[PDB]
Structure formats: structure tokens, C-alpha cells
UniProtKB/TrEMBL annotation, chains A, B:
The gene is UL19. It comes from the Viruses. This is Major capsid protein. The chain holds residues 51 to 99 of 1374 of the full protein.
Amino acid sequence: DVEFDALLGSYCNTLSLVRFLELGLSVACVCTKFPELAYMNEGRVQFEV
Amino acid sequence: DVEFDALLGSYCNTLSLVRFLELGLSVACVCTKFPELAYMNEGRVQFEV
């Protein structure tokens, strides 16, 4: 008697790595970085109109 | 501790300089200027028909 079992393939998934500036939405942003943001209580943005 | 910063990604548009001779309406005028109008009493314009 000859009998056996088998694995006939193992299939996986790859996560799509999405960057934000690669999107078409990024016109509504001005993506500038605070190196310090955790240290801030009140922030105001002042500009001349 | 009050930190003063300035962006480098975005700049304002404060003034919107509109000139009257940029408009389409400036056909309907004859824009000739005096540098002396306040010194003038009744000025007159003639027509011969």
C-alpha cells in the first residue's frame, strides 16, 4: 500500500505601499513638517491680507 | 517660550493690482487726465450738427 498527502502550493499577499504625495489629493495640502509639534500648546498662523 | 517661524513652501498674494486699462470696459471711455481740474470752474464741450 502506497498512500500520501500533499501541499499543492502556498499563496501569499503583498501589501500596497501607498505614499501620500503620490495621490492626486495632495494639492489641497501644503505638506510641511514640524520637527517639533508635541511641545506646542497654542499655534497661530499670521499672514497679510 | 514663544517660537517664531516662517514657511518655505507657501507664499501669500497680498495685493491684487487691477488697472482700469486692463479691463474691457476702457473702450467706452476717453481717459484723458488733467493735472489741474480742481482749479477749473464750468468747462464746456461744443457740438456742431
